[PDB]
Amino acid sequence: SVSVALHPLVILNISDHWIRMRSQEGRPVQVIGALIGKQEGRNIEVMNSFELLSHTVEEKIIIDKEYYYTKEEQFKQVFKELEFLGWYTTGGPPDPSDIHVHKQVCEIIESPLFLKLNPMTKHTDLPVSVFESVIDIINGEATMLFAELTYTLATEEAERIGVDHVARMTA
């Protein structure tokens, strides 16, 4: 149980990653990355994200750890006060592939957040969901599942040039 505030930039970044990869590959593809921000007590503020490299090995998605560590290192050289908080991907509801990848991310951080963005909604006006993992037992054995969390959009400073300011210009 945590409270989660999401900065608009995170949502825009993830959609951007998906749009750019779809253009590059000529088809929609799943994209994966890191969530960055701050946590104080049970309160998590998700401030930014960045793309991560993965490889498909024996038909499974493997996060490139060496890529991640270099990427994190460079990010922290600039943003000294921010921390890795979890990971994101795109698609529908959480699935067994997400579970397999989440277990890798659990090797980087204790209790990573998981954010999924659905790039194929036409109806929902914020196709983003956030999860934490839980280990449930029902017929003998530990089973990792995702529990969905409520989130809010993070309050931003008056001097920030944010989504409202820029949206006034686009249309």
Author numbering: 38 to 208
What does the paper say about this structure?
The Cop9 signalosome (CSN) is an eight-subunit complex that deneddylates cullins. Among the CSN MPN-containing subunits, CSN6 lacks a functional catalytic site and belongs to the MPN− class. In contrast, CSN5, also known as Jun-activatory binding protein 1 (Jab1) carries the catalytically competent MPN+/JAMM (Jab1-MPN-Mov34) motif. Here we report that CSN6 N-terminal domain containing its MPN domain can form a stable heterodimer with CSN5 catalytic domain in vitro.
The CSN6ΔC structure encompasses the typical MPN domain fold composed of a central β-sheet made of seven strands decorated by three α-helices and a small anti-parallel β-sheet in the Ins-1 region. The MPN core is extended by a C-terminal appendix (residues 192 to 208) that includes a small helical portion (α4 201 to 207). The asymmetric unit contains one CSN6ΔC molecule, but the crystallographic 2-fold symmetry operator generates an α-helix swapping-stabilised dimer, involving the C-terminal α4 helices. The same comparison of the monomeric form of human CSN6ΔC with human Rpn8ΔC and Drosophila CSN6ΔC gave rmsd values of 1.64 Å for 153 Cα pairs and 1.35 Å for 84 Cα pairs, respectively. Although not unambiguous, these NMR restraints were useful in combination with sequence conservation pattern and crystal packing information to delineate a CSN6ΔC surface potentially impacted by the addition of CSN5ΔC. The CSN6ΔC surface engaged in the binding to CSN5ΔC most likely corresponds to the region comprised between the α1/α2 helices, as delineated in Figure 2B with dotted grey line. Indeed the functional significance of this particular surface is strengthened by the facts that: (i) it is a highly conserved surface among CSN6 family members and (ii) it corresponds to the homodimer interface found in human CSN6ΔC and Rpn8ΔC crystal structures, as well as to the heterodimer interface found in budding yeast Rpn11ΔC/Rpn8ΔC. To further validate this interaction surface, we mutated two CSN6ΔC residues, H44 to an alanine and V115 to a glutamic acid, chosen for their high conservation and their positions on the putative interaction surface, and determined the effect of these mutations on the association with CSN5ΔC by ITC and activity measurements. The H44A variant showed a slight reduction in heterodimerisation compared with the WT control, whereas the V115E variant showed a significant 5-fold reduction in binding. Using this pro-Nedd8 gel shift assay, we showed that the hydrolytic activity of the CSN5ΔC,R106T/CSN6ΔC,H44A or V115E variant complexes was entirely compromised.
